[PDB]
Amino acid sequence: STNLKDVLASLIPKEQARIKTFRQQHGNTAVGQITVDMSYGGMRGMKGLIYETSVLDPDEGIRFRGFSIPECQKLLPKAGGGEEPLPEGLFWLLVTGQIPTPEQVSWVSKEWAKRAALPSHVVTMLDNFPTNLHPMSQLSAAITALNSESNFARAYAEGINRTKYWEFVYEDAMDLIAKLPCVAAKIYRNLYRAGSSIGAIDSKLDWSHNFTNMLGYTDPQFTELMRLYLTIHSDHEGGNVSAHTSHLVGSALSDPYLSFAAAMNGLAGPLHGLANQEVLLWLSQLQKDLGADASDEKLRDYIWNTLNSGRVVPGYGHAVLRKTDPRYTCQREFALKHLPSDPMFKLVAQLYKIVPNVLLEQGKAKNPWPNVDAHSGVLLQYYGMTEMNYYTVLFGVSRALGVLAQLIWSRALGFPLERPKSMSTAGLEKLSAGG
Amino acid sequence: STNLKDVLASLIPKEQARIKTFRQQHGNTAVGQITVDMSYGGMRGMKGLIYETSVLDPDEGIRFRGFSIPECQKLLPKAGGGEEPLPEGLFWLLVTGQIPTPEQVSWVSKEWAKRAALPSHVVTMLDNFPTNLHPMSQLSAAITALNSESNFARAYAEGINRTKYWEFVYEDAMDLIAKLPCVAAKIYRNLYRAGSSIGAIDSKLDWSHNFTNMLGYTDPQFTELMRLYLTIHSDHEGGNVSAHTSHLVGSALSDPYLSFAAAMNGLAGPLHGLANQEVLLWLSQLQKDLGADASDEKLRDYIWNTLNSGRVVPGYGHAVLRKTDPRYTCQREFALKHLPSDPMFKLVAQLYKIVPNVLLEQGKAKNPWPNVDAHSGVLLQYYGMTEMNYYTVLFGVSRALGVLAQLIWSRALGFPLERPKSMSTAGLEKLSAGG
């Protein structure tokens, strides 16, 4: 009765027409300029991509198809007896642009349970990886290796007409989402629960719940945390490194598996998703040097040492946001409700009072406020997930939702190869006169 | 006596100063505008990046630090008794901006021989991969898995001051270049020469020569072809999918292994590097349908069928070039000298007379001329490398030279995170009025 694929089939042609006409009227309209400083500055401030699923406001934070986090929390379907939004529902919203019914949500849950299966070659590879190989590397290689299963890759090789790309992208996307938790959980078990098994998928549970069972966690509040985590880490517009990388690779017609694996390699960078892990490592050294209950002046000192040593303070700052990330606020509120007295949380809370002032004093950061990565690990640690090198894997799993939702649209809308023009310093100087 | 690392140590500070001053004077100078059509069109025509190593001219083709291909052919050091430029020399040029001496070239050759070694976990993974897993996927996963060895990753984790990033990038870059041929050759042997071994590196040979020996080819002309191939596939400015992907991932501080693997995933796309393989598959179906010696009218028909079926004609067209790719011309000239009567070459030559006219007649392609991918496989096939699904691996190996040369510079120059702003259609319409 419910079939997302049938819903998209109706939506596609209309969006195609609307963009066609808009472009007819305003294709040559200028929306901005490019300066020397923007080229040298990693395109900061350049409007360079169309990405439909979410849009980030520098002051207000992210909107998912027009809704803020508080709105989603409020509108999206929850688990029975639950309080946090189910990521399945967030997926529906991103893809269709409409708030799903609970019935629609349960269909997604079933679909993902049905498609969850790992090929033996992938199981083998994971089982043979050494324990010093970083979890994000293990994740990316496994996803790359899953491409033997790609339906898009297969149809392409068979000569499918370009107009049908979206259909095969959608299949691969739902298959990949389905398989992610099995990949991620097998890594977790092999690394940290050596000799145990992930077990099997229960077609009757929500995606987050099967995931936490495979991770081996029983706490019900942990399940709720996982639901919220996976929902809020989902998408963050198109120019962030992971999304942009998936977009750019997907534009060459690489299949969703290859596109998502490349994105993971970008998420593994210390300036991107790896910050969630870095925050915890920095806090551990903190508590270690200073010891649990530090004074304000000592925290300052410690922050300064980092800055003075030519390092960044993880979890603070943003390329676009200019105010406190609502994703951070959202986490804080969860902590205040569930683990108000945890000492680490307490430390994280104290840094909120300090860090921004030091960054401001330093005068370099454009945004001295915290970002999502500053509050995520702390929540995880409380529930027993102390393996900090694994944190980014959770972010990867969530991020699949948003990048794949857009990927289906990029192909539906016929977006071409992403290929800007580059310039050398010497050539740019000439273009101007030099300096 | 020769030490590239010492050469870079002197060059870095000067370039830093020159860019600093230029930016002081012209940072706010506008170099272009952004239109609606550019955002929807994968940034076509947008000047968006600084990339130092090579610059592409739409009419004249690529220049490597200011030199054209014919110039390189002429200036770069050759093998003893050789005619084609050694890629080692091309690497020196890209990195320093100066033409190396043969003595400098031999140092690179030795250095790469010395650093060539594979960790057992990587050997194991390759040996367990199934034969239906595409060679490019196998390559990317192995490179990702090599990241356990990253020196950059390690130094970062130790808190290295940002000013020294370049030094560790350079080490990883030389290590990765060194190891590429062993990875690539082991895949080749496992897939197509099952039961045999790649053997060992001869510290006395050039990089291309150790590579062809590991691939198992004895023909001396094959060695010369490999030298030229690896030289010309090296770099193609910064906005091409593979280079741009390495640049973007590297900008988040992911190590060179992760950055290069992500790039490979972009090179594996049918619209990018996979075209070299696609051309051969299309030619095989051609010769199969029509049979070896086709007439012009029949080739036309065959081209039309492709176009009419909603597919691209591989090997023709470009996002930036507007005339015949000099890399194509360069290949043709090699063919004319060495394999003038090969029937496939002959076919490729015939298509040159036909394809462009049909594309022009169709009126959609901006560039109806051939690109590099249209002529590369044919050369390979002649020498016995008939495994067309493997062709893109060779391109990956070459491409490492250029993207890694730039990567060292990106970190030396302190380029920040690549993070443009995205927009939804709805938001863009609002920005204007709509349409």
Ligand SMILES: CC(C)(COP(=O)(O)OP(=O)(O)OC[C@H]1O[C@@H](n2cnc3c(N)ncnc32)[C@H](O)[C@@H]1OP(=O)(O)O)[C@@H](O)C(=O)NCCC(=O)NCCC[N+](=O)[O-]
């Ligand atoms: C997010 C980030 C990369 C944004 O980069 P940009 O847009 O280039 O930041 P911005 O324009 O503020 O840079 C101005 C200067 O302040 C410096 N600065 C910015 N944020 C920080 C920070 N948290 N700690 C120290 N220095 C900083 C920045 O490195 C730059 O210095 P320099 O000119 O010497 O290169 C940067 O804020 C950062 O490195 N933050 C710390 C790492 C982090 O938390 N990453 C996670 C972000 C979220 N995610 O991606 O999952």
Ligand SMILES: CC(C)(COP(=O)(O)OP(=O)(O)OC[C@H]1O[C@@H](n2cnc3c(N)ncnc32)[C@H](O)[C@@H]1OP(=O)(O)O)[C@@H](O)C(=O)NCCC(=O)NCCC[N+](=O)[O-]
């Ligand atoms: C290289 C390529 C992606 C450039 O893309 P663009 O800059 O978007 O090309 P362009 O501006 O000419 O596109 C105009 C129209 O012509 C179409 N067109 C362009 N080249 C081709 C071609 N070779 N065969 C059929 N149609 C083509 C193109 O798809 C587009 O159609 P639509 O509007 O319906 O989307 C495109 O020429 C192509 O698909 N070529 C064939 C694949 C190929 O040879 N790739 C290898 C390139 C080199 N490399 O990357 O290693």
